[PDB]
């Protein structure tokens, strides 16, 4: 996926962000990008929401609702935690 | 000034930010707070816009228009660069 652009699938789950200011799109992208990096560095164990929040730096760790949405989107779509129950 | 709240004077110059989402208010506050810290650690030399941008970390250094507005507001109101021509 491109690091610097939201996809069609993301638009469906984040219409508030894709329709909104560029700044907030960049926050979304940072959270998505970092979450995927954390998963791909260790893809044999479950990457949890709580663990993702603890491994994100300020200010990305401050909108906990946004981080939970990104995590949930990634897990439900299979981009993280594939094959982990 | 409070680190975690915008003032009446700031509201007059940043009506778009004070009326908008909490996330973006927190970005404004971080830029304002850090700019003041940089000035107060060395209050005998001019703190320029360019120098402020170079001493800010990502992602605060990415909305260069917002950083210039905060710098200009602080200098015109006398909170930084007092007595420097």
Curated annotation (Swiss-Prot), chains A, B:
Ubiquitously expressed. Component of a histone demethylase complex with RCOR1. Component of a RCOR/GFI/KDM1A/HDAC complex. Interacts directly with GFI1 and GFI1B. Interacts with INSM1 (via N-terminus). Component of a BHC histone deacetylase complex that contains HDAC1, HDAC2, HMG20B, KDM1A, RCOR1 and PHF21A. The BHC complex may also contain ZMYM2, ZNF217, ZMYM3, GSE1 and GTF2I. In the complex, RCOR1/CoREST strongly enhances the demethylase activity and protects it from the proteasome while PHF21A/BHC80 inhibits the demethylase activity. Interacts with the androgen receptor (AR). Disulfide bonds: none annotated. This is Lysine-specific histone demethylase 1A. Histone demethylase that can demethylate both 'Lys-4' (H3K4me) and 'Lys-9' (H3K9me) of histone H3, thereby acting as a coactivator or a corepressor, depending on the context. Acts by oxidizing the substrate by FAD to generate the corresponding imine that is subsequently hydrolyzed. Acts as a corepressor by mediating demethylation of H3K4me, a specific tag for epigenetic transcriptional activation. Demethylates both mono- (H3K4me1) and di-methylated (H3K4me2) H3K4me. May play a role in the repression of neuronal genes. It is found in: Nucleus; Chromosome. Induction: Down-regulated during neural differentiation in neuroblastoma cancer. Acetylated by KAT8 in epithelial but not in mesenchymal cells, thereby regulating the epithelial-to-mesenchymal transition. Acetylation by KAT8 reduces KDM1A association with nucleosomes, thereby decreasing histone H3 demethylation, leading to transcription activatio of target genes. The chain holds residues 183 to 267 of 852 of the full protein. Residues 1-85 form the SWIRM domain. The SWIRM domain may act as an anchor site for a histone tail. Belongs to the flavin monoamine oxidase family. It is linked to Cleft palate, psychomotor retardation, and distinctive facial features: A syndrome characterized by cleft palate, developmental delay, psychomotor retardation, and facial dysmorphic features including a prominent forehead, slightly arched eyebrows, elongated palpebral fissures, a wide nasal bridge, thin lips, and widely spaced teeth. Cleft palate is a congenital fissure of the soft and/or hard palate, due to faulty fusion. ACTH-independent macronodular adrenal hyperplasia 3: A form of macronodular adrenal hyperplasia, a rare adrenal defect characterized by multiple, bilateral, non-pigmented, benign, adrenocortical nodules. It results in excessive production of cortisol leading to ACTH-independent Cushing syndrome. Clinical manifestations of Cushing syndrome include facial and truncal obesity, abdominal striae, muscular weakness, osteoporosis, arterial hypertension, diabetes. AIMAH3 affected individuals have low fasting cortisol and ACTH, but excess cortisol is secreted after eating.
């Amino acid at each position: 996926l491109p690091h610097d652009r939201m996809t069609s699938q993301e638009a469906a789950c984040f219409p508030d962000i894709i329709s909104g200011p560029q700044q907030t799109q960049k926050v979304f992208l940072f959270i998505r990008n970092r979450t995927l990096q954390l998963w791909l560095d260790n893809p044999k164990i479950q990457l949890t929401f709580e663990a993702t929040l603890q491994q994100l730096e300020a200010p990305y760790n401050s909108d906990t609702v946004l981080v939970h949405r990104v995590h949930s989107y990634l897990e439900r779509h299979g981009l993280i935690n594939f094959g982990i129950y």
